[PDB]
Design a protein. Structure first.
Ligand code: R3A
Length: 236
């Protein structure tokens, strides 16, 4: 997250840190709890990942430094990547992780609702991107989970900024005209969460962008509402 601020304990209880454990243990991607055994994340996170054996999902984490040899985590039973996924920039950047056991909900770990049936025309004005990602192109994973409020931009404006890519109705973009606040490397797969009528909804999944927080180069996210049928089919 570029231009973000430190989050506090229990602030984003759906946010998870997905770690890889080979050849070293490190934060690979963000993700969101959407059910008792389900994490919604980005397909691009799994590039070169041999199998789910090397993955660990840590929930209720604020600082990456909290993760020690005795920190509880969930094993990953299955990785379900959308069958049309090719590369983040081309879309379908969505994946589900089925956990080896169920998540017991607490103040520190809770699911986030998907955009609701009947809310297709809602104009979201309170959207936040969170993650342990870079604060600039050449940086490192951050210790404390960062947050930044970002305004959504129309698909029409987004397409004008990315004339080399196909910005489809299955993507949603967000960014300030002058840049400054945005997602970056390491925020991949995490949520773009929007609060509407005091209820948080998982509107986007962090996917890609040209640079980080660059002027007129908004972040591009998987448009979750367009995958609700796919999510429901895979989770049932
Ligand atoms: C367009 C690619 C050359 C590449 N661009 S990048 O500058 O290296 C970069 C890297 C990661 C980013 C993530 Cl995860 C989120 N948001 C960004 N930018 C933004 N919100 N403005 C990211 C910018 C990029 O996005 N990815 C991510 C998807 O897998 C391929 C590499």
């Amino acid at each position: 997250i570029v231009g973000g601020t430190a989050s506090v304990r229990g602030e984003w209880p759906w946010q998870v840190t997905l770690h890889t454990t080979s050849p070293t243990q490190r934060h690979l991607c963000g993700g969101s709890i959407i059910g008792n055994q389900w994490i919604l994340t980005a397909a691009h996170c799994f590039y070169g990942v041999e199998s789910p054996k090397i993955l660990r999902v840590y929930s209720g984490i604020l600082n990456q430094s909290e993760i020690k040899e005795d920190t509880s985590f969930f094993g990953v039973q299955e990785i379900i990547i959308h069958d049309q996924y090719k590369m983040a920039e081309s879309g379908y950047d969505i994946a589900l992780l089925k956990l080896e056991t169920t998540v017991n909900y607490t103040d520190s770990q809770r699911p986030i609702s998907l955009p609701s049936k009947g809310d297709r025309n809602v104009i979201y004005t309170d959207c936040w991107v969170t993650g342990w990602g870079y604060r600039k192109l050449r940086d490192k994973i951050q210790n404390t989970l960062q947050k930044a409020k970002i305004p959504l931009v129309t698909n029409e404006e987004c397409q004008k900024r990315y004339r080399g890519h196909k910005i489809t109705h299955k993507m949603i973009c967000a960014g300030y005209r002058e840049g400054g606040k945005d997602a970056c490397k390491g925020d991949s797969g995490g949520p773009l969460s929007c609060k509407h009528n005091e209820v948080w909804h998982l509107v986007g999944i962090t996917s890609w962008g040209e640079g980080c927080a660059q002027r007129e180069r908004p972040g591009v996210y998987t448009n979750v509402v367009e995958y609700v049928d796919w999510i429901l089919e895979k989770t049932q």
